[PDB]
């Protein structure tokens, strides 16, 4: 059980088309024959599936010891029905076009599941950042954008890179600075070419913790749904149950704190080295220190090394957040859990899905969970496309206008019950007192994220009941994804051909 | 005491770096040695200080008598950490690269003190507009932009000119029309290349009086601060004290009315010709007529000519708003005032500062006062970048929604106290009645300006206490300025070098 | 014996580097250590070898029956040391990135062997032109350029497509017309984006027969070299020996006529269907008719069907001109020939080379033979980059000036021997009479091609003796190729890295 990662995501898309194909002909309003309309649907589905562009590079670089190297680099743009196309830049010696093509596809559907205006994209670099000088990573990241930009694969109108595995705000700043100063110098939207930038360079409050909140608001939108918890046989709530984490990195890290702050007791955590198992809870603050002190989660003196993979650890909510294809046909029989959230991108093989549906354990699709990161990188790309600190124009104004609603209510009452002259004191609460001056930059993020992953969780529930998919929310997700991208191709007069 | 105007502003920047350098190493989070980190700070400070681009021109023109002339023209772009770069266009026979370089620097800090997304810039033209036909000024202004545009010094992504000395809305319209019709024709943001345009050409309510409000809200934010007025030995309030004005032009003019309407009695006013001294108040309306009738503030029959410079006149609030370096080591001993506001750009020599701190008289930095003009020209550049009359989308909607808050409150009460059926009339006040339909174009200006210069006045107070700078708010201003521009260079991975 | 076609061409490049590496260190003039210089050479060699860009596409098309299809399309740009990059566009259901990458590499060396200023490139389309309407091929070819152009893979400054397998002047006209009218409309060099265009659309006399002349002048430059014919044991001349042809298409066709007109008796010919064997000669005119009448070379009533592959036919000069990898380890033992020319691109597997060197049969590298086609498509790209019919400016002038050389010689003699008054008639010959008006468009082609493949044949001979490669001219060719591309990288300061 190790399919070509692109043949796998295609496999999910397949079961999606196998169910939509019927409810999609009846919504096609053209005037043709029944079979003809189906010969129209299946055709458009064959256009969605493949990637529309897969660039492939090679970089002469000069390492600090003067020697040269080549660096294969990739970038796919899955679909063009929606511009621009976002997608992270991954640094790993395990990246390939067969991987990038699929990760590129997912973000075409992630962005469709959470209603974000972007096509899919993804860029890889065969590289191990743990090997190279922090000068060499600059000469590599800047060259990698110099190559893309001149071939039309970076720019606020075509593609928007983003952080991903083994990349952070450090790299994303090198990109925005190279693009702004070479190609899109005159363009007013220069700095808006990448997301995940540092705050001082045009970022957004909580771009790092963005994905974590995703995993959080996702789990919350289901744990607090009794219709499934009655099936899974658990309790709506967090402090009553626990969870584990694969891949203590950005997702895994912030998936903890936001899920740790509400009573859910993070049992264990692991990484490429080993596992750290404590059935009583690990402080996400303290462990975060060792990643900056001891280089690994190992040695953590408030837990122990675990002779076994996290995926088999007894818990309540499994969260693979480290790499692809981790759960598989050989790990599925030994999960011993109830819910498998997904921070990583397609961490479950399609063979293991049936076993999970068979074992009666709910799998929440990665299309829905790690989509939080996108929906915040959208606010960033949209922040620095308007050139204004959101809400700055109307801080002093909203603060005044609200002080005149409450006043008018007061002045109005002091004429009806004011016969005694009694001063009715209409004053804000503690909560409203914060929201007087309006929506600050952080407020729309903590809301626009919690809202985007509210509508999405419904549209997934609303579908899985319409088609009776039970706990295969994944298939229900692709249905909502495919139905949306279809109406774009259908009405667009797909081509000039 | 007549330093090179660029060696002067550098001198202020110096005393700024001399205090930040310590509290800035500890905020640098890189992993190096102490001395190394200081070898990193001082280096970045040497990058901020100089101008990154100083163009220099020469114009063949054809005067109306057919003769040719050359016209030296300058433009500096101080820093590029923030695009675009705004900066006025000054017409004076006293402009030079040594001047423009410094005025360019100030606006890099002005924009940093009031948190406005622009680098600094400034453009000069060795010219005397009082000499040339109002046709020749067009052939000069249009040629001056034709030259800049083709070399990448005008355009909504690089630079945005603005009014300044001896230029008004007349000139700024010639620029926007030349740029829109030659270089950026196809660009959607063509007309957004300059600010200070006429309203019919995309201006903003009160762009002329914008700078005056700055000087006003600045003074107000300090006069109403007892912590200093206890030191200066005066009273928080305006009608109890007076003020004078140097340079009756745009700043000086509107600095009067907005400071005249609140009881502060404008004692005198002067210009290149002479002074007009009346210890009982000059009507800013009446005097404004003579500038359009008698060509000068002289002859004003409700005052007298003053055999002396304004800077020595007895008053309470001195406002130099005419030119640079006016106060100096020779004028400082004879100020006879309490507060010296600054409408002009660096009207005080650094030598006179010590004398002012010694004489125990508070000097409000020009970085803070005339920054109002920028913060409104930002709203303009941001108005005509969105292509919509701000608030037009939601006039009829907010008006309705507010009529349903007040109604719901009424309908809610008529069920609790409505046992008598008594019609509770929840109706807006007089004030709220204006703010029903929402934020109009003028409302955000009168607020966004009053708000921007609220946060700034605090950050300056908040610093001058943290470092104990007493009344040298100027040094406190640069500290806040330098700390902000530093975090941009620091995190940006300053160069690809 | 069926290596990955890119692992094969790499294999030749390898044996090339294995011999140059020594004679290339001594020509490196930098000041380093011996081993260091070798750590510099091997590094640059690792930069040359891989492709710098390999795009990959997918086309929604609308077949005439209304159904949709996807069409994978590829394009590689091997190297960028020389812009633009030429390369054909092949239509075949057997194309893939693993093929295009190598064919792209060859043209980086072809162009280096014949000193033509282009990097390598190649574009494929998984398609069978024998299946689609001649309308559908237009909707496919135009879309394929629309996709490339917007991503910077067509244009006289980056890439220049050209005819190749299953494409002719029909397709190349659709490309030039689509590019000229969409992307490079304003560009003055629009129509110069592709070569192989029809004459009326900016072609060159004999662009079709261009490659054939290549195969001809190549063979001639060796057959008339006794130094090898003494080794091979044959006779310098054509009418005394015969030859066969694989792949009667463009190359194979015109390889016949130009080699048929000089006595060499074309024995047989074959194609995807079958062979046509006549040991007495096939009229290239008559057989050309059946390709336009009977759809195949079969049925040709002046020969017979041959139960066997051409590659084993007894002859004197074998010319595979149909596809890749035709000769191989299984066909090498049964060649029964003396010289194997190569019209096709790498039609010989590296394993069969040793067998050919062992069997003492000379293999002429495809790098040298089919390079004629490029050297004419260069004249085209250079014709329509100058916007003038070459030689038109000086037809009437050269005709006059020559009539004054011959006259002056006459007038000069009629003073020395003119004592008798005898009219010396200095008049042109028959041959010169043609070349009076100068170099017409066709003359430079028939010369610039015959000349380009003169210098190249020497530099290959001049190398194979310097290094004693005997009859492995192929390895001698790559040596001259690598030595040239190396001096470009070496001196260029290879990167900004
Ligand atoms: N971080 C983000 O912004 C986003 C991340 N994701 C997904 O989340 C996943 C992880 O987040 P990242 O930020 O990439 O974390 P990261 O970039 O910090 O690295 C993940 C960590 O997991 C560990 N790990 C990697 N492979 C492993 C394996 N096979 N077994 C055990 N441990 C392993 C590594 O030590 C690494 O520290 C990624 O796979 C990505 O697909 C998706 C969207 C946004
Ligand atoms: N290089 C570029 O083109 C960049 C452009 N931008 C744009 O600027 C706007 C900034 O808004 P926000 O940062 O959200 O406001 P904000 O109030 O969130 O500002 C965040 C930080 O930026 C600093 N800052 C503000 N103005 C500055 C200036 N003129 N110079 C140096 N530092 C300054 C402030 O001190 C604050 O610490 C964004 O909308 C973005 O579109 C932002 C970053 C880089
Ligand atoms: N007006 C604006 O939009 C802004 C102005 N400023 C600063 O405000 C100052 C004045 O405002 P402007 O609009 O330029 O005024 P303005 O362009 O109307 O001219 C200033 C007036 O002051 C008088 N004056 C000039 N030099 C003088 C001297 N040495 N002694 C006595 N009188 C003199 C002149 O007669 C002139 O009428 C300028 O120096 C400029 O740096 C700063 C930001 C924006
Ligand atoms: N040349 C250009 O490209 C210009 C573009 N603009 C853009 O147009 C927008 C206009 O909004 P505001 O002026 O703030 O609205 P507004 O309500 O403030 O309009 C101000 C004046 O413009 C006049 N006006 C409005 N639409 C007009 C039209 N179609 N033709 C002639 N006059 C008209 C109105 O009568 C009004 O007196 C701005 O956002 C600006 O971005 C503005 C000026 C010039
Ligand atoms: N024609 C040109 O302009 C140039 C051609 N070449 C090379 O010359 C070769 C042939 O020239 P083209 O113009 O492509 O000819 P073409 O495009 O007319 O087709 C070649 C012919 O050979 C036959 N053929 C193909 N594969 C075969 C196989 N496996 N067995 C038997 N017969 C087969 C086909 O029936 C076809 O008619 C190509 O492989 C190409 O690499 C190289 C440079 C320029
Ligand atoms: N669409 C475009 O931009 C094209 C531009 N060109 C340029 O035009 C130049 C033409 O030179 P050659 O064709 O080598 O000269 P040529 O003497 O070889 O002309 C070849 C044919 O073109 C025809 N022709 C010449 N001028 C014409 C015109 N104004 N309208 C229609 N047909 C005409 C002639 O009758 C002749 O049959 C080339 O240098 C090429 O650069 C050529 C073809 C297409
Ligand atoms: N690595 C790390 N990041 C943190 C930590 N605390 C907060 N952050 C991030 O830094 C940002 C600033 O935190 P706050 O000032 O508390 O604002 P906030 O958004 O209310 O913080 P949260 O509610 O925890 O998301 C947050 O949005 C988080 O994304 C922490 O302890 N460790
Ligand atoms: N030169 C000059 N300008 C004026 C005068 N009165 C108003 N203005 C400017 O013209 C604009 C229109 O004035 P109003 O209709 O009163 O609107 P406003 O913003 O409430 O006016 P103010 O509150 O005085 O700023 C104002 O914003 C001022 O900038 C005046 O008497 N003389
Ligand atoms: N298919 C085909 N093409 C031909 C034939 N004869 C000539 N051509 C091509 O058409 C062009 C015009 O031929 P010519 O007028 O004889 O000029 P040319 O260049 O002297 O012809 P060649 O010397 O045979 O190359 C030639 O350059 C050939 O490329 C032919 O019989 N069949």
UniProtKB/Swiss-Prot annotation, chains A, B, C:
Modification sites for N6-malonyllysine: 396, 442, 466
Catalytic activity: L-glutamate + NAD(+) + H2O = 2-oxoglutarate + NH4(+) + NADH + H(+); L-glutamate + NADP(+) + H2O = 2-oxoglutarate + NH4(+) + NADPH + H(+)
Processing after translation: ADP-ribosylated by SIRT4, leading to inactivate glutamate dehydrogenase activity. Stoichiometry shows that ADP-ribosylation occurs in one subunit per catalytically active homohexamer.
Binding site for NAD(+): 80-82, 115, 191, 383
EC identifiers of the protein: 1.4.1.3
Residues reported to bind ADP: 389, 455
Residues given in the record as substrate binding sites: 86, 110, 377
Any one GO CC term of the record: endoplasmic reticulum
BP terms from Gene Ontology: glutamate catabolic process; glutamine metabolic process; tricarboxylic acid metabolic process
Binding site for GTP: 205, 209, 258, 261
UniProt activity-regulation remark: Subject to allosteric regulation. Activated by ADP. Inhibited by GTP and ATP. ADP can occupy the NADH binding site and activate the enzyme. Inhibited by SIRT4. Inhibited by HADH.
Chain positions found as ADP-ribosylcysteine: 111
Modified residues (N6-succinyllysine): 7, 23, 49, 101, 122, 130, 139, 285, 291, 302, 304, 329, 354, 396, 416, 419, 442, 466, 484
Residues bearing the modification Phosphoserine: 18, 67, 166, 323
Subcellular location: Mitochondrion; Endoplasmic reticulum
Entry similarity comment: Belongs to the Glu/Leu/Phe/Val dehydrogenases family.
Protein name: Glutamate dehydrogenase 1, mitochondrial
Species whose genome carries this gene: Bos taurus (Bovine)
């Amino acid at each position: 059980d190790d399919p070509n990662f692109f043949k796998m995501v295609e496999g999910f898309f397949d079961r999606g088309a196998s169910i939509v194909e019927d409810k999609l002909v009846e919504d096609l309003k053209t005037r043709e024959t029944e079979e003809q309309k189906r010969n129209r649907v299946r055709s458009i589905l064959r256009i969605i599936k493949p990637c529309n562009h897969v660039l492939s590079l090679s970089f002469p670089i000069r390492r600090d010891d003067g020697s040269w190297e080549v660096i294969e680099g990739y970038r796919a743009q899955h679909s063009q029905h929606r511009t621009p196309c976002k997608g992270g830049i991954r640094y790993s010696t395990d990246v390939s076009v067969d991987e990038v093509k699929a990760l590129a596809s997912l973000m075409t559907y992630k962005c469709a599941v959470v209603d974000v205006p972007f096509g899919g994209a993804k860029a890889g670099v065969k590289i191990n950042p743990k090997n190279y000088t922090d000068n060499e990573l600059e000469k590599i990241t800047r060259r990698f954008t110099m190559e893309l930009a001149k071939k039309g694969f970076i720019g606020p109108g075509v593609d928007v890179p983003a952080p991903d595995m083994s990349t952070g705000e450090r790299e994303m700043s090198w990109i925005a600075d190279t693009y702004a100063s070479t190609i899109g110098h005159y363009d007013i939207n220069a700095h808006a070419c990448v997301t995940g930038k540092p705050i001082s360079q045009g970022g957004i409050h909580g771009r790092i913790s963005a994905t974590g909140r995703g995993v959080f608001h996702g789990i919350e939108n289901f744990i607090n749904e009794a219709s499934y918890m009655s099936i899974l046989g658990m309790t709506p709530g967090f402090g009553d149950k626990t969870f584990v984490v694969q891949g203590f990195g950005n997702v895994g890290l912030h998936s903890m704190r936001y899920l740790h702050r509400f009573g859910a007791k993070c049992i264990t955590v692991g990484e490429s080295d080993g596992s750290i198992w404590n059935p009583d809870g690990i402080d996400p603050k303290e462990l975060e220190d060792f990643k900056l002190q001891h280089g690994t989660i190992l040695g953590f003196p408030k837990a122990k090394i675990y002779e076994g993979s996290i995926l088999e650890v007894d818990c309540d909510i499994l969260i693979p957040a480290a790499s692809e294809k981790q759960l598989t046909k050989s790990n599925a029989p030994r999960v011993k859990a109830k819910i498998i959230a997904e921070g990583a991108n397609g961490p479950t093989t399609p063979e293991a899905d049936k076993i999970f549906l068979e074992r009666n354990i709910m799998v929440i699709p990665d299309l829905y969970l790690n989509a939080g990161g996108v929906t915040v990188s959208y606010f960033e790309w949209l922040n620095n496309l308007n050139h204004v600190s959101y809400g700055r124009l109307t801080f002093k104004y909203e603060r005044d206008s609200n002080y005149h609603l409450l006043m008018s209510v007061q002045e109005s009452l002091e004429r009806k019950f004011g016969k005694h002259g009694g001063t009715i004191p209409i004053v804000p609460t503690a909560e409203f007192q914060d929201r007087i001056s309006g929506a600050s930059e952080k407020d729309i993020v903590h809301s626009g994220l919690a809202y985007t992953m509210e509508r999405s969780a419904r549209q997934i529930m609303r579908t899985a009941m319409k088609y009776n998919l039970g706990l295969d929310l994944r298939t229900a997700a692709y249905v909502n994804a495919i139905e949306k991208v279809f109406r774009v191709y259908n009405e667009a007069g797909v081509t000039f051909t």
